[PDB]
Design a protein around this ligand. Structure first.
Ligand SMILES: *[C@@H]1O[C@H](CO)[C@@H](O)[C@H](O)[C@H]1NC(C)=O
Ligand SMILES: *[C@@H]1O[C@H](CO)[C@@H](O)[C@H](O)[C@H]1NC(C)=O
Lengths: 49, 44
């Protein structure tokens, strides 16, 4: 439920780069594929089960 | 003083925007590499 985003999946470490203003990550089908943890900055890759 | 002053070189440009539709190409890093207009030329 990252920052008010009710979703189910698997969270793993991601090496993708983020621009300083950029927070989320999106794909061709408007599905969130990356988030930044509000408490600690990190890169997480959401992958379905 | 207020009357009498020498200033160095300086150049600037001012332009005006308008509502247009553009096509933007991203790269692997996530930085915009190219952009092309949609209402300028037939090829565009
Ligand atoms: C909130 O969490 C951040 C990240 O650990 C920390 O730097 C900050 O001091 C915390 N603030 C409070 C009020 O807990
Ligand atoms: C420059 O200095 C003179 C010295 O009296 C003064 O009268 C003058 O007001 C000054 N220049 C400006 C723009 O105030």
């Amino acid at each position: 439920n990252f920052n008010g985003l009710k979703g189910t999946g698997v969270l793993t470490e991601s090496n993708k780069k983020f621009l300083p203003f950029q927070q989320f990550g999106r794909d061709i089908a408007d599905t969130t594929d990356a988030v930044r943890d509000p408490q600690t900055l990190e890169i997480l890759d959401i992958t379905p089960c | 003083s207020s009357s009498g002053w020498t200033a160095g070189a300086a150049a600037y440009y001012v332009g005006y925007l308008q509502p247009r539709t553009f096509l933007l190409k991203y790269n692997e890093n996530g930085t915009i590499t190219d952009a092309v207009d949609c209402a300028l030329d037939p090829l565009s």
